[model samples]
Every structure is written in C-alpha cells, then in structure tokens.
Target: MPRVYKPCFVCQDKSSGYHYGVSACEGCKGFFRRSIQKNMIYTCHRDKNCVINKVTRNRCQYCRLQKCFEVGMSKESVRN
Candidate 1:
C-alpha cells in the first residue's frame, strides 16, 4: 500500500485558510507573516500565564511559534 500524508489540520478548515507550509496550513502562514510585518510583541497579558490551547493559540504569535516547535515543526523542514 502506498503511504499518504495527512492534510494539514488548519488547512482542512473551510472557513479560512490560515496555515500554509509543508506541515502547516494557511492560517499559520498569515499569522506568521503578520507577526513579522508588524514586529508584534505578544505579552502573556494574563498574569504572564496563558494556556496555549487550540482555541486561544491564534492570539499569541510568540506562543504559537513556540507551540509549533513543541509539536515538532522544525526550521530545518522549511523549504528555502
């Protein structure tokens, strides 16, 4: 049997395409762009403590990227 890679979780979302990379979807792509463009500095804002759950992740660009690494999205994997 041939192996098939799974489509990105955020990409499968029909409402908006956010993450867009080999592993990420389109939402994350836009978020990363905006963060870089604006030079956004995200603070925890909540007692310097915030849960980076799926629902709340989009709020913090810093934390989101951290989670991306925690979940195994590597810079080495990115295409040049």
Candidate 2:
C-alpha cells in the first residue's frame, strides 16, 4: 500500500489524477495555479484551520491554498 493512488487534494476527491507533482482535481489544480499566479493570501475566521474538501473548499480561500502547498504540490508544475 505504499504507492496507493492519490487523494483529490484540496477537495477530498479520490477520483482524480496527478498535477503539480501530485494528484489533484482539474478545477483545484487551476485554482492552485491562480494562487501562485499572484502568490496571494486570504483570511479565515475559524482559527485559520478550516477543513478542506469539496464541501468546505470555499469556506476559506487561504486554507485551501495552504492545503495546496501542504499536499506537496508544486509551482513549476504550474508551468512545466
């Protein structure tokens, strides 16, 4: 079970493929692209630690973005 598939990263979506050095959803992958485009930041009212999934992905923009990096995603992946 060492090389099992991958999580939908950023959205708890199991049915996904690789992106930016890790598997991710098409939507979230681009969502991550945009994040690095500006390398921006956002705010959170819930301890800055919000659960990230398809349901709560929109709950905290920053949280989702952080999850993007936390999951071992990549910046170069955004380009090549």
Candidate 3:
C-alpha cells in the first residue's frame, strides 16, 4: 500500500513532522522557531482573519502565528 502523507495542522501544507506538539510543515516549523527565538512581534494590516495556507502564509505573519496558536502549537514543546 502507498503511504498517505498528512497535511500540516497549521497551514494545510505537506507535514514534515510533529513540531511543537503539532503536525507541521517545514516552513511553519521554521517560522514558529524564528518568531519564538527572536521574540518577534507581528501586526496585521488587514482584518485578523487572514487565510493561512502554504502559498499565502507569508502574507501576514500575525495571522500565521495566530493560527499556530489556535491550532495548538505549544511553545513549551519547543526545545533547543
């Protein structure tokens, strides 16, 4: 049988592995890591409800990070 790959829990992209306790793609994993490591702040120019998908995720870091939290990406799970 062929293996079925799961989509990222946050962005609906191909999931690389479990990150911060959630299934996530590499892009989202990196994004979350950088944001937490740098203590970065993001603001949304548009409404807060931005679509979070693989192609459009970079459009708004605010919404992307928000979705990460909404989908249960735990900062406590991140390790050095």
Candidate 4:
C-alpha cells in the first residue's frame, strides 16, 4: 500500500507543513500557530465546526479529531 500522508487535526487535509517534523497541513499549521502564539481559543460556535475528510470535513471538531486519528495523525509527531 502507498504511504498516505497524515490528515491534519484541524482540517483533515493531507498535511503539507511539517511542524516539529509532523506533517501538519497549512490550515492546521496556521491554526496551531495562532492558538499558541496568540492564545486563541477557537470555539466552533456550532459544535466545534472543525472539518474532516474531503467533503463534509468542515463539520465539527468532534469529527475532525476522530478523522485525524483515522488518517493516522499522531501527537508524538510533534517535537519539543
């Protein structure tokens, strides 16, 4: 099987930017950055409208994180 890229925890897209060596897609990278740098608390307003998959991904954080793991994204990929 071909090695598929890990999906982003925030967007569920194949990660492009390798944050701390973890393949974090542009959206996640930006989100993570803003969340960390600015201490931003992103509330979905509508059930954590975080996205996952290619289509209905822009749905909820509940699904977003679930798909993130389904796509093989790992927190261990992040480095200190």
TM-score of each: 0.41, 0.59, 0.63, 0.45
Candidate numbers, best TM-score first, in rank order: 3, 2, 4, 1
Error of 4 at 14 (Å): 4.1
| lDDT computed for candidate 4 | 0.46
lDDT of 1 by residue, 1-80 (tens): 12233233322222233333345544555555555445555553333334343343324555554444354443323332
Models ranked on lDDT: 3, 2, 4, 1
Please tell me which model should have the higher lDDT, number 1 or number 4: 4
Q: How would you encode candidate 2's per-residue C-alpha lDDT over 5-47 as one tens digit per residue?
A: 4364656655466656677767766667776565545474454
Candidate 2's C-alpha runs over 4 A off are 1-6, 43-47, 76-80
- For model 3, residues 1-80, the per-residue Cα lDDT tens digits are 12244345666656776656677767766777666556565576455777665445444556766776676676533443
Looking at model 3, the pairs that clash are none
Tell me which of candidates 3 and 4 scores higher on TM-score. Answer: 3
Best model number under lDDT: 3
Q: Top TM-score: which candidate number?
A: 3
Which residue runs does candidate 3 get wrong by more than 4 Å? 1-6, 45-47, 53-58, 76-80
lDDT of each: 0.42, 0.59, 0.61, 0.46
Deviation from native of the Cα of residue 34 in model 4, angstroms: 1.5
List the pairs of residues colliding in candidate 2.
none
Q: What residue runs in model 4 are displaced by over 4 Å at the alpha carbon?
A: 1-10, 59-80
Model 2: which ten-residue window has the lowest total lDDT?
1-10
